[PDB]
Paper text:
Interestingly, in the ADCS structure without any reaction ligands bound to the glutaminase active site, we observed a metal ion with tetrahedrally coordinated interactions to the two PabA catalytic triad residues aC79 and aH168 as well as to aH128 next to the PabA active site, as evidenced by an anomalous electron density map. As the coordination geometry of this site did not match any of the ions added during ADCS purification or crystallization (Na+, K+, and Mg2+), we searched for alternative metal ions by X-ray fluorescence (XRF) analysis. The resulting data allowed assigning the bound metal ion as Zn2+ that fits well with the predicted coordination geometry. As Zn2+ was not added at any stage during purification and crystallization, the most plausible explanation for its presence is its extraction from the expression host. Comparison of the glutaminase active site geometry in the presence and absence of Zn2+ allowed to identify conformational changes associated with Zn2+ binding. While we did not detect any significant positional changes for the catalytic triad residues aC79, aH168, and aE170, the side chain of aH128 flips from an orientation blocking the PabA active site in the presence of Zn2+ to a conformation, in which it integrates into an interaction network forming the glutaminase active site in a catalytically competent conformation, in the absence of Zn2+. However, our biochemical data did not reveal any effect of Zn2+ on ADCS activity. The associated changes are most visibly illustrated by a long-range movement of residue bE119 from the PabB subunit, which is 10−13 Å from any PabA residues in different ADCS structures devoid of Gln-TE in the glutaminase active site. In all ADCS structures, we found a structurally conserved Trp molecule bound to each PabB synthase subunit, in agreement with previous structural data of closely related synthase subunits or domains of ADCS and anthranilate synthase (AS).
Here, we chose aminodeoxychorismate synthase (ADCS) from Escherichia coli, which consists of a class I glutaminase subunit (PabA) and a synthase subunit (PabB), to investigate the mechanism of glutaminase catalysis regulation and its impact on overall GAT activity. PabB catalyzes the amination of chorismate (Cho) to 4-amino-4-deoxy-chorismate, which is a committed step in folic acid biosynthesis. GATs comprise minimally a glutaminase that produces ammonia, which reacts with a synthase-bound substrate to yield specific nitrogen-containing products. As evidenced by analytical gel filtration and isothermal titration calorimetry (ITC) data, the PabA and PabB subunits form a heterodimeric assembly with a dissociation constant KD = 0.16 ± 0.06 μM.
Author numbering:
A (entry chain AAA): -1 to 187
B (entry chain DDD): 0 to 453
The structure:
Amino acid sequence: GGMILLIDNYDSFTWNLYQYFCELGADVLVKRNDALTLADIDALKPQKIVISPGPCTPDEAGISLDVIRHYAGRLPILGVCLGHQAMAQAFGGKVVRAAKVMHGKTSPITHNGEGVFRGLANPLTVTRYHSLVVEPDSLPACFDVTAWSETREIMGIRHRQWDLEGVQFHPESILSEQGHQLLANFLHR
Amino acid sequence: HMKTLSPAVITLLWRQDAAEFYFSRLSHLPWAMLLHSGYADHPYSRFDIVVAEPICTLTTFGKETVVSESEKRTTTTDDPLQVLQQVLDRADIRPTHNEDLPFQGGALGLFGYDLGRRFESLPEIAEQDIVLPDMAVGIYDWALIVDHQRHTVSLLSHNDVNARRAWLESQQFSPQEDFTLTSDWQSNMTREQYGEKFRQVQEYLHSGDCYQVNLAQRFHATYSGDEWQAFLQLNQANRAPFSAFLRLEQGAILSLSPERFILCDNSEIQTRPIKGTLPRLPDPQEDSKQAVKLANSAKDRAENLMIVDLMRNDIGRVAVAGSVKVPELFVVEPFPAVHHLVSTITAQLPEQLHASDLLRAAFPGGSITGAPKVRAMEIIDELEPQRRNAWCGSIGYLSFCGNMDTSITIRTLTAINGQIFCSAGGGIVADSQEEAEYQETFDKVNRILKQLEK
Ligand SMILES: N[C@@H](Cc1c[nH]c2ccccc12)C(=O)O
Ligand SMILES: [Cl-]
Ligand SMILES: [Cl-]
Ligand SMILES: [Cl-]
Ligand SMILES: [Cl-]
Ligand SMILES: [Mg+2]
Ligand SMILES: [Zn+2]
């Protein structure tokens, strides 16, 4: 029995994520990255937090980084695309150009059946809208990689101790398989 | 409000052509409007709607809406769809839904593409060379409904349906001088100039500004004679289920649109984005093959799903809770000129919203702008020489009962002070190819353009 806070980082498909979560029975509060402070979050008392995709860098994602630093190990956090990159960067990871431009291409990803991939089919076909990946050689030791592209780019990370996980792709997208079961893992873990 | 009672209905004599027969005599009256299902065999081709003689009109040019009643005329800078909803509410006609009578009176007319500039801040690079409203909507307290499923012709009115029957039967039809084109068709761009714009768009897709852009060209010719005779012959040939003839104060809109923008039927929302087209082929064996090539083309399925993701988001902003579903993907719909790839998104309108609020959230269509929508529109304004005006807007109705249906005004001509305009576009992705997409525009309107050449 808990509200989910979706931090909107001004993506074009933010309501697709809100609707997917609503389809799964979740009470979602949508607040924008510049419309919330960490103190405001404490009083809203969320049970879980999702950092939405966005066109900006983690630095320009308002309170996104601030939220990860403060709530890591206190509340479950999911990061999607930008939210995933912000998650990596907050622990000392770097973001880099992808291999090629990935504008609504789908791609098969292999995974280890851990975190949000618990119970899901392997491989999984998913869509990427954005052209930046987490740098593997830089990835902090506190994260396992949960999924890889055909190219061995990072498509998911999970913290080894705390409930906080990131996916590079768009599960909310109709082009992406088992988006519902993926987000249901996060919701009901 | 004051009138919750259902409108009085009179059934007239069934004939398949009832709408063209009754509308002939009204075709010359400003604010006379026909929505025609093109006589199409199509799951969304059932109703022809005829209105005229509105109790109230709304005209939007730029930041001003003029609302004209009998003698009263007001001007306002307010949101045009908020003004429209206020006028509907102020009419104090509130009937229950009737599945057989989807428009029970209310608003009907044109929402032009450049009405979108009232909902988003956009650059002003493209040249405004057609003076015709961004919104031209009449309020009607009556209608004539032709139902091709029940084979019924219904005349409804919230005033005196008997007087309206007589008023209608009393009007008579002196066929006007026949339509002729008095010049050849001429594009607003050379094939060279298309390229320069096609390359500039792909340059913008590589930067990852946007993922998709509908790039359009416009053909113009001079004409003389009655636009209604042109429409009768185009309507026959195009069999398009979202066809319309609007007589405006400034000119006529001849819509042969096959595309539905948004339907709101007893709070059940539906949108059917067209994205993906292959031309139709002479040999009936080779043409059945095109329908499978189109359905099974990975490039074309990708482009479509991008637009489904866009429409899911536009509708999802305002839809109820977890109501946004995608019940059907990549159905191929054959039309005389072209096969089209059509996907359908459904949702529920919350009781706190109106169909007008739904229309504001989604307008203009993702299917004819691109993704992200605002950047696609920025680029379109930057590269297309002239504003789109009535083309790639919407024609449709907002019933007093709460229902709505709208088109996208593709395959739509504007006829104004002796000039006739026809536009054709096509979705551009990084993968797509200059000559294919240039030729795609021609394939979309050639039968239209050539049918009018004599
Ligand atoms: N085809 C629609 C009615 C319709 C015809 N042409 C239109 C143009 C715009 C909006 C609706 C329409 C139906 O059966 O209900
Ligand atoms: Cl198209
Ligand atoms: Cl299939
Ligand atoms: Cl579904
Ligand atoms: Cl077109
Ligand atoms: Mg195409
Ligand atoms: Zn992304």
